[PDB]
């Protein structure tokens, strides 16, 4: 067997630790019930590879489960392996919240993102500052007319300007101007960072929450079918109540050939 | 693993402990009555038909 050289495409965040959050979808507390069923399944899979799965936020279901649950799975090759869980996972089963006894198609959603801890990037490098000392405006005396002590700083890379003209001395007026300039630098960068979070999650969790990508988990028949590729096994319980390595693997093998 | 098991149960074993009764009618290994060679289910099925001599519904 001539092993095809798979050492041509590189990957940055392929071995980094990954955040994994599961959110309930269509179907009330039934999808919340299943979001725990997906989370235990990823918990069985993380511990089966000696990984550190650590929950950071959860919202319990009305009758048991998880409306939301975000966890940090740490280890070797975490994101490069679970990055095919991002999307909408469909369910078809006889609910535990059923009154009559009919199949109900609920759905859940999973988000998988790398680590890349946010940096500080602070203490405002001056080489990007243009300090402007001029005269104040308003009440005072001869001191206002003569003594300047009106300050305005300008951060060139971002364009954020701030001027402070409260107390008399410009040094106590520059101190407030410096701290506010950095406060606007950080609030503006923290904007551009969380804008990148809600823009990537929106195109990964699928706004539609009943008919979208990934797998459908049918319990009456026993069919775990992943629609991305073209393989429908019958593990179900084995994959769910345990790990699922040989299911991600046919997805990676086809994605390689892509 | 069924017909092979109703067969292996017939052949005499390597050691006399390994012998065990199977229901001669349906092949059941559990709840086999020695007196009849039948399991509790077949015992009931034939008895209701009347194909067990002298056997009848017991009431007291």
């Amino acid at each position: 067997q001539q092993l095809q050289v798979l050492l041509l495409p590189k990957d940055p965040d392929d071995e980094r630790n990954a955040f994994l959050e599961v959110r309930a979808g269509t179907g009330g507390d039934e999808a919340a019930l299943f979001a725990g069923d997906l989370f235990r399944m990823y918990s069985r899979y993380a511990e089966a590879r000696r990984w550190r799965v650590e929950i950071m936020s959860a919202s319990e279901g009305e009758h048991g489960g998880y409306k939301e649950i975000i966890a940090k799975i740490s280890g070797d090759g975490v994101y490069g392996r679970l990055k095919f869980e991002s999307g909408g996972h469909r369910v078809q089963r006889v609910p535990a919240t059923e009154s009559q006894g009919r199949i109900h198609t609920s759905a859940c959603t999973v988000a998988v993102m790398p680590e890349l801890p946010d940096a500080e990037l602070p203490d405002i490098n001056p080489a990007d500052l243009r300090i402007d000392t001029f005269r104040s405006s308003g009440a005072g005396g001869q001191h206002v007319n003569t003594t300047d002590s009106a300050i305005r700083i300008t951060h060139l890379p971002t364009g954020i300007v701030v001027e402070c003209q409260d107390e008399r001395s410009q040094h106590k007026n520059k101190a407030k101007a410096l701290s506010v300039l950095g406060a606007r630098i950080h609030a503006a960068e923290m904007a551009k960072r969380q804008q990148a979070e809600a823009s990537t999650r929106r195109n990964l969790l699928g706004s539609g929450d009943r008919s979208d990508r990934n797998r459908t988990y049918n319990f009456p028949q026993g069919r775990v079918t992943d629609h991305r590729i073209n393989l429908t096994l019958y593990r179900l319980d084995e994959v769910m109540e345990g790990k699922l390595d040989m299911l991600i693997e046919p997805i990676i093998q086809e994605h390689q050939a892509d | 693993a069924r017909k092979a098991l109703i067969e292996k149960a017939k052949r005499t074993p390597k050691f006399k402990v390994r012998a065990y009764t199977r229901c001669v009618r349906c092949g059941r290994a559990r709840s086999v009555y020695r007196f009849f060679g039948l399991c509790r289910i077949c015992l009931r099925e034939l008895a209701h038909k009347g194909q067990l001599p002298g056997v009848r519904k017991a009431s007291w």
Binding site: - | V24, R25, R34, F35, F36, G37, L46, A47, H48, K49, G50, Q51, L52, P53, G54, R56, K57
Partner: protein
């Protein structure tokens, strides 16, 4: 799912065993097994004849099998052709003196196991199950029975949703011990699945 089997409920009151003999603790099983094998062979070979009851007797090394049937000729053959062929197939399996008799079923339309097998045949021929059941009951009542009830359960007509269809006429007092009720069951194998057929004939009370 409740009702008791109507024959086993009347054993030794209105209905008599089909294997009448005595045997001791050490022997009972082997006689019973051979008894069922006799029925096994005969149930297959004698089906076309109209097999209703298979009585069996035993004394010591000799056994007498009395076959009740609607078409005695189909059993006997031409001057004894098949009747002789049977004893050889028989006493080969038996390994002992296997006396084989035949006896008439005076009214096959008053024999519940016969009525049951007829409807089962009708529904393997893709006949209208409900029309058949009303007919079967109509035959049994014309033949003089005091009451009749016939039941068919399964994928009736091929339908995906299983159902139970029955029809009845006259009296069928399944709770009365002294009421003589013949009972019979017939399995109808189709392309879509198995249908169960139950026939109750109330001949009269004793």
């Amino acid at each position: 799912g409740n009702k008791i089997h109507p024959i086993g409920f009347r054993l030794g009151i209105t209905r008599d065993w089909e294997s009448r003999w005595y045997a001791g603790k050490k022997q009972y099983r082997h006689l019973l097994l051979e008894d069922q094998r006799i029925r096994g062979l005969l149930e297959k070979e004698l089906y076309s004849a109209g097999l209703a009851r298979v009585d069996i007797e035993r004394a010591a090394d000799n056994v007498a099998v009395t076959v009740h049937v609607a078409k005695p000729g189909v059993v006997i053959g031409r001057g004894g052709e098949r009747i002789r062929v049977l004893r050889e197939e028989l006493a080969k399996l038996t390994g002992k003196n296997v006396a084989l008799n035949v006896q008439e079923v005076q009214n096959p339309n008053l024999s519940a196991p016969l009525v049951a097998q007829r409807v089962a045949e009708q529904i393997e021929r893709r006949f209208a199950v409900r029309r058949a059941i009303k007919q079967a009951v109509q035959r049994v009542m014309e033949s003089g029975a005091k009451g009749a009830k016939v039941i068919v359960s399964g994928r009736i007509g091929g339908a995906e949703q299983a159902r139970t269809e029955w029809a009845a006429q006259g009296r069928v007092p399944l709770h009365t011990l002294r009421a003589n009720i013949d009972y019979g069951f017939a399995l109808a194998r189709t392309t879509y699945g198995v249908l169960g057929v139950k026939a109750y004939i109330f001949l009269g009370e004793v």
